[PDB]
């Protein structure tokens, strides 16, 4: 059986504009030369985002009306580059004429007759702006560049966009306004236009008033033009027009393209223009959202609740003793970012995993998206999420519930329940509750949905599926057979999946009196439109399931008899307790806020950390797959090398080495670490030296010198394929040291930027920044890594050893000699040679407004390069100028920007929106100050540091921040600022907390790792090393008297702080009251804590396994 593909059906063509619609006018793709004009396609449920609203004002009542697409109830006449919607709202007739003509110009005339005394009309157009695959790939991310421009011309309120991220090499353009009337209101974001209100009413927010008329530059670009109030008796017509240039280089001044605009105006097509059947939903009502739960129904539900988090007294989310968080339905309603999580099922901790399962849910009834077997992108069965307020609700597994005469889809719940085994959704009805759960099967690559009314009644479904079998829907055609009950769904050969994994298959067990169609039985006449829309019907049923499989290499087995998500649940959180050893914060008294935070967030930071690494892709990230280099060996190494996971953690080097590129011999940016052939060869300067900095952390911790020696291939630069000439990982390391060696400034040691740094919006704008250009951090990281390294490969190599201990020694000179002045250590130096030299982002740089840069100031004490003095010094400029209430700050002030244009650094500069790295707060940031901290035993400030980007009751801790979803990560934290030249102006609101901020996006980052390597390695103070223990803890008073359940070397032991200024020593550690022996750990800045024999502290552990840790901060 093969699943045919959807092709929008109406096409209008004109020049080099391409624009498709649905049967029933629905936007698909609109198309100008390489240009992607809107930002969603349309699907044959919901229609599109974009519309044209009717409203009409009386004195007891406000109507709107959509004019266009399928929800207007429209009809349509269609020629070669026309369309015309016809129809009746209330007594006024309308005309919509849509026309398309050659100059990259559209028409949207607008014709009314009939009478009523107060009417407007709403545009309303979602925007892309980016070439095809951009749209695609992250609609959020290529929001965030399109700067808009607002002006008023003839006819009120023009939008003038410019995409400030380059499409090919392209810069694209839009204008949008109106003609014979005038637009007096305007909006630019969705947030703006539907509200966070539409996640439950499914009605966009505006329509009961006027638009704000601001700028938000966020994530949903999306235009809306509000026209003046007129009345109607006759007829009225007017248009509203969009304009789109392909390249559009300069900024953005004025309204421009004023005559062609009057020319395309004059355009019209002189075919004829012939009616089209439109299919048209039959019993299909608005979505069903959830009542909201009362304190009674709450308490039934969840009677035993932890850290209670509520707003004028709402309970908005909490957490339990089963390690479930739970949103209220409130949330939801006031965060601007959706609840959500991904499923993944369990895998051998120690190997780097292949084929694992994962799937994607939220709250919004979004039940299970990018269901996919190993490759996040490819190997797919459900398409993805995609925007933020549900507005096109058709991804991935979507559930109707017939209400009285109509099918409804699910969408709000009252509660949602999140473990790491899985989501349920609970929604009330009239008298019933039912019960949707999505969970992970414990050892089989499964998922699992099931439906329950708690009463027992018996409702009618359809369980819709928007297919993929392949990365994206609508591509191509899907293999399906159907044996019974079982469904099996397998790519056709054009799919890219097909030439890697052959074998790939899907199955899915169905319940056995369903029917099986596309959308077809949506529609009144039975028409299919997107035939790979797959729909289950489920008749008079009380409950039911479907259970998903997947197989990236055929390996088929069996469907089990029940799927009980309980037993799951149950092996889950052994598995998760496994995989941070056991973690446990006690105390006798009450524990302290923070300790019952680190127990309650530490299994979800768990979980992130573990997607990051073996199923890469996060919720607004959906697109990721492979591993990033420097990520891989941040989050994941860290994760695993704080809590043992040795063996895997040589893996993922020997993976990792493998993946070293032939010829220039660093590594790509970015690569796949299964069968698919793809990496991002072009790096930035930084990258080389994480994996050489990994290598060397693994070998201190294990002693594991082995690993060098291994025989280990390379890949090709281009192919991204084995080059079938292994070397030994320590000849890899070699080769890599040499491109650091050409890094050198000449007559010096200081190391070029090359592609970049750490911060990837810091590329550099041209060549010579890419040549002259020296990063304070990356500098210091080079002698990080060189020291670790030469530490590592003494015992093997004493020669090489000897040559990276050098280096290190002429890197840190020339960091002393060149990058700090007045105590203050500069962001970039700027040398075309010894005569030439400037300093960027440091005091002397008296032209710019930025003065400080926070990263070479952490890096500088983590790495105890920087003299106590210095690092002394480093944390006063910290407090001063970079510290704020939601964590320290990236710089002083926010980079340039002039319309989107860059000068120094690309997308820093050219990101319209405030959010991710340009917030400034980037949280993976604020945790290496966390290290950095550490390192210096300042327990009050690491504590407080590690509070201030905690989720749980954050909003508590840190007064300006707006709630976001408390379990899981968010990536950065960025005030409310609707634009950059806001931002610029009023950004000291941040130092002092006079704005709110809100949290950036969730989930996949270095973060959830490298914070649990913070807790448990660096504050609570548990170390690993080659048969040793590390003893070092850097604690605050509060923590007196707390235990730490933690299993070292295997073996489950007890640590009980205490913490006491007035000790002759810095730290003693007792068992059953006999002292411990070892030696004193090094550290520049503070005395050290112990380092004990693991013989030593095992045979301790069996006679008395509760361990007493003295020590005075
Ligand atoms: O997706 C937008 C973000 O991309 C980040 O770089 C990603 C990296 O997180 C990921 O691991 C690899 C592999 O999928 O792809 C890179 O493009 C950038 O750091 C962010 O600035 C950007 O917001
Ligand atoms: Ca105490």
């Given at each position: 059986?093969?699943?045919?593909?959807?092709?929008?059906?109406?096409?209008l063509?004109?020049?080099?504009?391409?624009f498709?619609?649905?049967?029933?006018?629905?936007?698909?793709?609109?198309?100008h030369?390489?240009?992607?004009?809107?930002?969603?396609?349309g699907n044959?449920?919901?229609?599109?985002?974009?519309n044209?609203?009717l409203?009409?004002?009386?004195?007891?009542?406000?109507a709107?009306?959509?004019l266009?697409?399928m929800?207007?109830?429209?009809?349509?006449?269609?020629?070669?580059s026309?369309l015309?919607?016809?129809?009746?709202?209330?007594?006024?007739?309308?005309?919509?004429t849509?026309?398309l003509?050659p100059?990259?110009?559209?028409?949207?005339?607008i014709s009314?007759?009939?009478?009523?005394?107060?009417?407007?009309?709403?545009?309303?157009?979602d925007i892309?702006?980016?070439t095809?695959?951009?749209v695609?790939s992250?609609?959020?991310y290529?929001?965030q560049?399109?700067?808009?421009?607002?002006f008023?011309?003839?006819?009120?309120?023009?939008?003038?966009?410019?995409?400030?991220?380059?499409?090919?090499?392209?810069?694209?353009?839009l204008?949008?306004?109106?003609?014979?009337?005038?637009?007096?209101?305007?909006?630019?974001?969705?947030?703006?236009?539907?509200?966070?209100?539409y996640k439950?009413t499914?009605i966009?927010?505006?329509?009961?008033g006027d638009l704000?008329?601001?700028?938000?530059?966020?994530?949903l670009?999306?235009?809306?033009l509000?026209t003046?109030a007129?009345?109607?008796?006759?007829?009225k017509q007017?248009?509203?027009?969009g304009?789109?240039?392909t390249?559009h280089?300069?900024?953005?001044?004025?309204?421009?393209?004023?005559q062609?605009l009057?020319?395309?105006?004059?355009?019209?097509?002189?075919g004829?223009?012939?009616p089209?059947?439109?299919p048209?939903?039959?019993?299909?009502?608005?979505?069903?959202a959830?009542?909201?739960?009362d304190?009674?129904?709450?308490?039934?539900?969840?009677?035993?609740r932890?850290?209670?988090?509520?707003?004028e007294?709402?309970?908005?989310?909490?957490?339990?003793?089963?390690?479930?968080?739970?949103v209220?339905?409130?949330?939801?309603?006031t965060?601007?970012?959706?609840?959500?999580?991904?499923?993944?099922?369990?895998?051998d901790?120690?190997?780097?995993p292949?084929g694992?399962?994962?799937?994607?849910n939220?709250?919004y009834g979004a039940?299970?998206?990018?269901?996919?077997?190993?490759?996040?992108t490819?190997?797919?069965?459900?398409?993805?999420?995609?925007?933020?307020?549900?507005?096109?609700?058709?991804?991935?597994q979507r559930?109707?519930?017939?209400?009285?005469?109509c099918y409804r889809?699910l969408?709000?719940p009252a509660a949602?329940e999140?473990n790491?085994?899985g989501?349920?959704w609970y929604?009330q009805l009239?008298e019933?509750?039912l019960?949707?759960?999505?969970?992970?099967?414990?050892?089989?690559?499964?998922?699992?949905?099931?439906?329950?009314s708690?009463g027992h009644?018996?409702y009618?479904?359809?369980?819709?599926?928007?297919?993929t079998?392949?990365?994206n829907?609508?591509?191509?055609e899907?293999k399906?057979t159907?044996?019974?009950?079982?469904?099996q769904?397998?790519?056709?050969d054009?799919?890219?999946?097909?030439?890697?994994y052959?074998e790939?298959?899907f199955?899915?067990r169905?319940?056995?009196?369903?029917?099986?169609s596309?959308?077809?039985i949506?529609?009144?006449?039975?028409?299919?439109?997107?035939?790979?829309?797959?729909?289950?019907?489920?008749?008079?049923?009380?409950?039911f399931?479907?259970?998903?499989?997947?197989?990236?290499?055929?390996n088929?087995i069996?469907?089990?008899?029940?799927?009980?998500?309980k037993e799951?649940?149950?092996?889950?959180?052994?598995?998760?307790?496994?995989?941070?050893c056991?973690?446990?914060?006690?105390?006798?008294?009450?524990?302290?806020?923070?300790?019952?935070?680190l127990?309650?967030?530490?299994?979800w930071?768990?979980?992130?950390?573990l997607?990051?690494?073996?199923?890469?892709?996060?919720?607004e990230?959906?697109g990721?797959?492979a591993w990033?280099?420097?990520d891989?060996?941040?989050?994941?190494i860290?994760?695993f090398?704080?809590?043992?996971?040795?063996d895997?953690?040589?893996?993922i080097?020997?993976?990792?080495y493998?993946?070293?590129?032939e010829?220039?011999?660093?590594?790509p940016?970015?690569?796949?670490?299964?069968?698919?052939p793809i990496?991002?060869?072009?790096?930035?300067?930084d990258?080389?030296?994480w994996?050489?900095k990994?290598?060397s952390?693994?070998?201190?911790?294990?002693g594991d010198?082995?690993?060098?020696?291994?025989?280990?291939?390379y890949?090709?630069?281009?192919?991204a394929?084995?080059?079938?000439?292994?070397?030994?990982?320590?000849?890899?390391?070699?080769?890599?040291v040499?491109?650091?060696?050409?890094?050198?400034?000449?007559?010096?040691?200081?190391?070029?930027?090359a592609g970049?740094d750490?911060?990837?919006?810091?590329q550099?704008?041209?060549?010579?920044?890419?040549?002259?250009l020296?990063?304070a951090?990356?500098?210091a990281?080079?002698?990080?890594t060189?020291?670790?390294?030469?530490?590592?490969?003494?015992?093997?190599?004493?020669?090489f050893?000897k040559?990276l201990?050098?280096?290190?020694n002429?890197?840190?000179?020339?960091?002393?000699?060149?990058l700090?002045?007045?105590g203050?250590?500069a962001?970039?130096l700027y040398?075309?040679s010894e005569?030439?030299?400037?300093?960027?982002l440091?005091?002397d740089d008296?032209?710019?407004?930025?003065?400080?840069?926070?990263?070479?100031l952490?890096?500088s004490?983590?790495?105890?390069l920087?003299d106590?003095?210095?690092?002394t010094?480093?944390?006063?400029?910290?407090?001063?100028?970079?510290?704020?209430?939601?964590?320290?700050?990236?710089?002083?002030?926010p980079?340039?920007?002039?319309?989107?244009?860059?000068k120094?650094?690309?997308?820093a500069?050219?990101?319209?929106?405030?959010?991710?790295?340009?917030?400034?707060?980037?949280?993976?940031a604020?945790?290496?100050?966390?290290?950095?901290?550490?390192?210096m035993?300042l327990?009050?400030?690491?504590?407080?540091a590690?509070?201030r980007?905690?989720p749980?009751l954050?909003?508590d801790?840190?007064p300006?921040?707006?709630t976001?979803?408390?379990?899981?990560?968010?990536?950065?934290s960025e005030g409310?600022?609707?634009?950059?030249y806001?931002?610029?102006?009023?950004f000291?609101?941040?130092?002092?907390?006079?704005?709110?901020v809100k949290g950036?996006?969730?989930?996949?980052?270095?973060?959830?790792?490298?914070?649990?390597?913070?807790?448990?390695?660096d504050?609570?103070?548990?170390?690993?090393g080659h048969?040793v223990?590390?003893?070092d803890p850097?604690?605050?008073?509060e923590?007196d008297?707390?235990?730490?359940?933690?299993?070292?070397?295997?073996?489950?032991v007890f640590?009980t702080?205490?913490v006491?200024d007035?000790?002759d020593?810095?730290?003693?550690?007792?068992?059953?009251?006999?002292?411990?022996?070892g030696?004193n750990?090094?550290?520049?800045?503070?005395?050290?804590?112990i380092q004990?024999?693991?013989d030593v502290f095992?045979?301790?552990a069996?006679?008395?396994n509760?361990f007493?840790?003295?020590?005075k901060?």
């Amino acid at each position: 059986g093969i699943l045919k593909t959807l092709s929008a059906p109406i096409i209008l063509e004109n020049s080099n504009s391409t624009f498709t619609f649905l049967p029933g006018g629905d936007n698909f793709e609109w198309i100008h030369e390489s240009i992607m004009i809107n930002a969603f396609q349309g699907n044959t449920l919901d229609g599109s985002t974009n519309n044209l609203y009717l409203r009409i004002y009386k004195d007891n009542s406000l109507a709107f009306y959509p004019l266009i697409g399928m929800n207007s109830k429209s009809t349509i006449k269609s020629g070669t580059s026309t369309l015309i919607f016809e129809g009746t709202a209330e007594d006024i007739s309308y005309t919509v004429t849509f026309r398309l003509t050659p100059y990259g110009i559209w028409f949207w005339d607008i014709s009314l007759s009939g009478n009523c005394n107060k009417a407007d009309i709403i545009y309303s157009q979602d925007i892309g702006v980016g070439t095809k695959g951009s749209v695609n790939s992250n609609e959020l991310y290529l929001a965030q560049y399109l700067g808009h421009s607002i002006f008023q011309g003839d006819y009120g309120y023009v939008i003038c966009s410019r995409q400030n991220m380059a499409q090919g090499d392209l810069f694209p353009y839009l204008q949008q306004g109106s003609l014979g009337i005038r637009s007096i209101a305007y909006s630019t974001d969705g947030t703006q236009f539907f509200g966070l209100s539409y996640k439950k009413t499914n009605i966009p927010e505006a329509l009961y008033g006027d638009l704000p008329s601001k700028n938000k530059q966020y994530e949903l670009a999306h235009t809306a033009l509000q026209t003046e109030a007129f009345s109607l008796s006759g007829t009225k017509q007017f248009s509203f027009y969009g304009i789109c240039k392909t390249n559009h280089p300069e900024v953005i001044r004025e309204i421009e393209y004023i005559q062609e605009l009057e020319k395309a105006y004059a355009y019209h097509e002189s075919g004829e223009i012939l009616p089209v059947n439109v299919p048209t939903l039959q019993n299909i009502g608005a979505p069903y959202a959830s009542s909201r739960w009362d304190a009674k129904q709450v308490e039934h539900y969840f009677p035993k609740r932890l850290l209670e988090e509520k707003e004028e007294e709402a309970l908005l989310s909490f957490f339990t003793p089963e390690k479930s968080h739970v949103v209220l339905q409130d949330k939801e309603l006031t965060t601007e970012r959706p609840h959500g999580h991904i499923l993944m099922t369990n895998f051998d901790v120690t190997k780097v995993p292949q084929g694992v399962v994962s799937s994607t849910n939220y709250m919004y009834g979004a039940f299970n998206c990018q269901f996919v077997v190993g490759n996040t992108t490819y190997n797919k069965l459900l398409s993805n999420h995609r925007g933020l307020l549900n507005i096109q609700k058709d991804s991935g597994q979507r559930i109707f519930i017939k209400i009285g005469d109509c099918y409804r889809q699910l969408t709000l719940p009252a509660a949602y329940e999140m473990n790491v085994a899985g989501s349920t959704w609970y929604y009330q009805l009239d008298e019933d509750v039912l019960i949707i759960t999505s969970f992970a099967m414990y050892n089989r690559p499964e998922i699992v949905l099931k439906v329950q009314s708690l009463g027992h009644k018996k409702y009618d479904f359809i369980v819709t599926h928007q297919l993929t079998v392949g990365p994206n829907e609508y591509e191509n055609e899907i293999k399906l057979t159907r044996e019974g009950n079982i469904l099996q769904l397998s790519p056709t050969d054009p799919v890219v999946t097909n030439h890697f994994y052959p074998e790939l298959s899907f199955r899915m067990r169905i319940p056995e009196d369903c029917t099986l169609s596309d959308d077809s039985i949506f529609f009144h006449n039975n028409t299919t439109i997107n035939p790979s829309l797959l729909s289950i019907e489920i008749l008079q049923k009380s409950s039911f399931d479907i259970v998903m499989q997947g197989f990236d290499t055929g390996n088929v087995i069996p469907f089990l008899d029940q799927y009980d998500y309980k037993e799951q649940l149950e092996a889950y959180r052994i598995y998760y307790d496994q995989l941070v050893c056991n973690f446990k914060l006690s105390a006798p008294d009450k524990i302290p806020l923070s300790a019952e935070k680190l127990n309650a967030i530490i299994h979800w930071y768990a979980h992130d950390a573990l997607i990051h690494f073996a199923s890469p892709h996060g919720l607004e990230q959906s697109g990721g797959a492979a591993w990033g280099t420097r990520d891989v060996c941040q989050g994941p190494i860290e994760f695993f090398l704080t809590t043992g996971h040795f063996d895997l953690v040589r893996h993922i080097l020997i993976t990792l080495y493998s993946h070293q590129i032939e010829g220039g011999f660093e590594w790509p940016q970015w690569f796949m670490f299964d069968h698919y052939p793809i990496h991002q060869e072009d790096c930035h300067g930084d990258v080389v030296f994480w994996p050489l900095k990994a290598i060397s952390d693994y070998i201190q911790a294990t002693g594991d010198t082995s690993i060098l020696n291994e025989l280990v291939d390379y890949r090709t630069a281009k192919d991204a394929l084995p080059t079938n000439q292994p070397e030994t990982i320590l000849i890899h390391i070699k080769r890599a040291v040499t491109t650091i060696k050409n890094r050198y400034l000449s007559g010096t040691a200081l190391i070029s930027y090359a592609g970049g740094d750490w911060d990837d919006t810091l590329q550099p704008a041209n060549s010579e920044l890419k040549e002259n250009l020296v990063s304070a951090w990356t500098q210091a990281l080079a002698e990080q890594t060189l020291e670790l390294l030469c530490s590592a490969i003494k015992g093997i190599d004493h020669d090489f050893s000897k040559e990276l201990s050098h280096m290190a020694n002429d890197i840190r000179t020339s960091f002393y000699q060149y990058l700090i002045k007045d105590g203050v250590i500069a962001g970039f130096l700027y040398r075309e040679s010894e005569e030439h030299m400037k300093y960027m982002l440091h005091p002397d740089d008296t032209e710019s407004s930025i003065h400080y840069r926070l990263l070479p100031l952490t890096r500088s004490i983590i790495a105890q390069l920087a003299d106590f003095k210095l690092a002394t010094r480093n944390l006063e400029i910290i407090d001063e100028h970079l510290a704020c209430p939601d964590g320290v700050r990236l710089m002083d002030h926010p980079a340039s920007y002039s319309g989107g244009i860059s000068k120094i650094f690309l997308r820093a500069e050219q990101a319209a929106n405030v959010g991710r790295e340009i917030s400034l707060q980037y949280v993976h940031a604020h945790i290496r100050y966390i290290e950095a901290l550490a390192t210096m035993g300042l327990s009050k400030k690491a504590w407080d540091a590690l509070m201030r980007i905690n989720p749980i009751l954050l909003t508590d801790y840190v007064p300006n921040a707006l709630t976001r979803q408390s379990n899981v990560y968010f990536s950065s934290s960025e005030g409310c600022f609707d634009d950059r030249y806001e931002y610029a102006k009023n950004f000291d609101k941040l130092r002092t907390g006079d704005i709110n901020v809100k949290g950036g996006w969730r989930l996949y980052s270095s973060g959830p790792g490298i914070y649990i390597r913070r807790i448990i390695a660096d504050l609570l103070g548990i170390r690993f090393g080659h048969n040793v223990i590390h003893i070092d803890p850097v604690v605050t008073k509060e923590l007196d008297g707390v235990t730490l359940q933690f299993t070292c070397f295997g073996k489950t032991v007890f640590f009980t702080y205490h913490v006491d200024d007035t000790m002759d020593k810095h730290i003693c550690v007792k068992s059953n009251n006999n002292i411990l022996p070892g030696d004193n750990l090094n550290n520049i800045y503070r005395d050290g804590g112990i380092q004990i024999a693991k013989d030593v502290f095992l045979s301790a552990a069996m006679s008395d396994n509760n361990f007493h840790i003295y020590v005075k901060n």
